[PDB]
C-alpha cells in the first residue's frame, strides 16, 4: 500500500523520457542512469549498492537493443524492474513452520523500532491469514509499561500474554512460556525481547541466553525504516552478534525514500519478511519485492440487485485475488483520474437505497414524482437520481456490448 | 498589436469601462486579447474532466485590442506607444515620458 513515494517521484520523470522513445542509444541509457544514480543516492541507498546496481543495469540495457528492437524502452524498464526486484530480495520469503509445534519466533531490535506493536501485528496476521493459534510473551522487563502495553494488545486480539512480572529473568520467562505452549497446543510463540536506545554488551548477552534456552526457528529484527542507513547498520550488528533469519521493516507509512529496504539484503543477506504500515494491529503485510519494484517505477502488472452487489463489493468488499491487488495497486497506477467518490460514493449508496423492492427490480418503472419522492428521501433533488439512472443505462449498454 | 502578454491594461470601451487588468492571452490572428476581469460570461457545459459536476462556469471572454491602452509607468494614465532602439533590442516607449513598457 504505502512507501517509496519520493524515490518514485524522482525516477519516474527520467523513466518517462526513455519509455516514450522506443529507440535506445548509448547516450540515452547513460543519461537515464545518471538520474537513477542520483535518485538512489538521495534516497539514502547504500553507496556500494548504488554503484553495483547502476553497473549491472547499464550493462544489460545496451545489449538489450541488440537483445530486441521491439518495445526497446519498455525493455529498459523491465531490466530496471528486474534488478530492483533482486535488490529487495528475489521473491516473497515466507514464515518458517517448525516440524514440531510450537514455532518459536524471537523479536529483537532497539527501543522505538516497534517491537512490542509488531509482535501483536504478527500474532494477528498468523491467526487471520494462516489460521494459527499464537501466544505472546513478555520478555522485556526493563521498562515499566512494557508489559501492560503487550497485555493491552493481547486483550484486543483475545490471545494470551505470558508474564511473570519484572523481577524474573527473561531466560526463565521464555522457558516456561514455551512449555505452557506445548501443553496447551499453541502453534506459535512470539517473544517480545528487551532493548535500549543503542546496542550494548548486556543486551546481547541476554539475547544469546534467550536464543539458547528457546532454540527459536525465526529471529526477526524489527527496525525503523525511516532511519535509512542507520537501520542497515543495526541489522549488520544484530546479524553478527546473534543470528538473524528475517527483518520486519516498520513505519513505511512515513518513509518516502526507501534506502533501508533497497539495501538490507545486499549488506546483510537477511531477507525482509514483513512491512509495518501503521499504528493499528492490522497494518502488517508480507514484503513482496516484485510489487514494490513495480510501484517504484509506476508500472502495473436485476439492476437493483447488481447495484447493491457492486456497492457491497466496492465500498467495503475491497480485496481482489489472482493479481487483482497487484494490477490495482495505487488505484491501478492512478488511471489518469484524480477524483474518488468517497462521500460522493456514500451519497450514491444512500440514493441507491431510496427505493422499494419493485423499484429495485424495475428501475424504469419510477415515474417523475415517483423518484421525486425518492430524491426527497435521498437528499439530491433530481441530480443524484438522474445521474444514477444514466450510470445504470451506461452499465446496461456496456453489458450489452460485452455480451 | 500594441500590447503584449503581461501588460497592466486599463480598458477603454464596453460595459467594463475603465478598470485595471493583466493580459493572460493575446490572440493576434483575430486581434482579440483576453484581459482578466473583463467580459465575465457564463458558459454551460455538461461534461468536465477531472471530477464532472457540469454546472454553469464563470469565464472571461476576449475583447478587441482597440478597447485597450497600456499605462505609462510614471503617471499611471493611459497613453499611446512608440518604438525606439535602446542600444540593442527595440522597446515600447510610452508617450508623454521616456520610460519603457
Amino acid at each position: 500500500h504505502m512507501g517509496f513515494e519520493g524515490l518514485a517521484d524522482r525516477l519516474q520523470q527520467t523513466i518517462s523520457k526513455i519509455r516514450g522513445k522506443g529507440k535506445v542509444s548509448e547516450q540515452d541509457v547513460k543519461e537515464m542512469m545518471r538520474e537513477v544514480r542520483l535518485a538512489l543516492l538521495e534516497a539514502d541507498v547504500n553507496f556500494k549498492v548504488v554503484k553495483d546496481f547502476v553497473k549491472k543495469v547499464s550493462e544489460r540495457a545496451v545489449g538489450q537493443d541488440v537483445m530486441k528492437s521491439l518495445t526497446p524502452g519498455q525493455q529498459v524498464i523491465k531490466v530496471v524492474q528486474e534488478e530492483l526486484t533482486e535488490l529487495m530480495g528475489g521473491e516473497e520469503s515466507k514464515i518458517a513452520v517448525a516440524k514440531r509445534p510450537p514455532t518459536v519466533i524471537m523479536m529483537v531490535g532497539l527501543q522505538g523500532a516497534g517491537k512490542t506493536t509488531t509482535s501483536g501485528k504478527l500474532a494477528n496476521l498468523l491467526r487471520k491469514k494462516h489460521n494459527r493459534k499464537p501466544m505472546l510473551v513478555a520478555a522485556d522487563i526493563y521498562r515499566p509499561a512494557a508489559i501492560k502495553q503487550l497485555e493491552t494488545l493481547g486483550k484486543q486480539l483475545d490471545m494470551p500474554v505470558f508474564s511473570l512480572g519484572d523481577q524474573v529473568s527473561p531466560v526463565e520467562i521464555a522457558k516456561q512460556a514455551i512449555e505452557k505452549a506445548k501443553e496447551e497446543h499453541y502453534d506459535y510463540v512470539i517473544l517480545d525481547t528487551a532493548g535500549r536506545l543503542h546496542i550494548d554488551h548486556e543486551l546481547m548477552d541476554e539475547l544469546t541466553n534467550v536464543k539458547e534456552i528457546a532454540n527459536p526457528e525465526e529471529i526477526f529484527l524489527v527496525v525503523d525504516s525511516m532511519t535509512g542507513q542507520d537501520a542497515v547498520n543495526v541489522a549488520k550488528s544484530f546479524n553478527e552478534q546473534l543470528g538473524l533469519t528475517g527483518v520486519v521493516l516498520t513505519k513505511l507509512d512515513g518513509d518516502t525514500r526507501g534506502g533501508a529496504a533497497l539495501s538490507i539484503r545486499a549488506v546483510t543477506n537477511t531477507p525482509i519478511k514483513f512491512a509495518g504500515l501503521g499504528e493499528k494491529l492490522d497494518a502488517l503485510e508480507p514484503f513482496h519485492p516484485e510489487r514494490m519494484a513495480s510501484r517504484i517505477l509506476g508500472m502495473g502488472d436485476t439492476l437493483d440487485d447488481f447495484l447493491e452487489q457492486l456497492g457491497q463489493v466496492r465500498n467495503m468488499g475491497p480485496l481482489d485475488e489472482l493479481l487483482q491487488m497487484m494490477p490495482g495497486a495505487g488505484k491501478m497506477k492512478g488511471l489518469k483520474n484524480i477524483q474518488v467518490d468517497e462521500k460522493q460514493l456514500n451519497h450514491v449508496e444512500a440514493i441507491i437505497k431510496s427505493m422499494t423492492v419493485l423499484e429495485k427490480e424495475q428501475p424504469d418503472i419510477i415515474n417523475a414524482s415517483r423518484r421525486k419522492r425518492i430524491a426527497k428521501g435521498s437528499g439530491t433533488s433530481v441530480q443524484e437520481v438522474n445521474r444514477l439512472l444514466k450510470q445504470f443505462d451506461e452499465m446496461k449498454k456496456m453489458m450489452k456490448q460485452m455480451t | 498589436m500594441h500590447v503584449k502578454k503581461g501588460d497592466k491594461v486599463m480598458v477603454i470601451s464596453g460595459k467594463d469601462k475603465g478598470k485595471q487588468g493583466t493580459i493572460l492571452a493575446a490572440f493576434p490572428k483575430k486581434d482579440r486579447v483576453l484581459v482578466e476581469g473583463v467580459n465575465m460570461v457564463k458558459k454551460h457545459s455538461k461534461p468536465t474532466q477531472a471530477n464532472p459536476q457540469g454546472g454553469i462556469s464563470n469565464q472571461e471572454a476576449p475583447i478587441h485590442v482597440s478597447n485597450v491602452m497600456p499605462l505609462d509607468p510614471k503617471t499611471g494614465e493611459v497613453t499611446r506607444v512608440g518604438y525606439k532602439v535602446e542600444d540593442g533590442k527595440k522597446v515600447r516607449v510610452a508617450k508623454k515620458s521616456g520610460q519603457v513598457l
Partner: peptide, 19 residues
C-alpha cells in the same frame, strides 16, 4: 470481456464511466 465490464461498472459506481 466480463472482467472489463465488471471493472467499468465498478468505476461508474465509484464515480462515472467515460461516454
Amino acid at each position: 470481456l466480463f472482467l472489463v465490464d465488471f471493472f467499468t461498472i465498478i468505476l461508474p459506481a465509484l464515480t462515472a464511466i467515460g461516454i
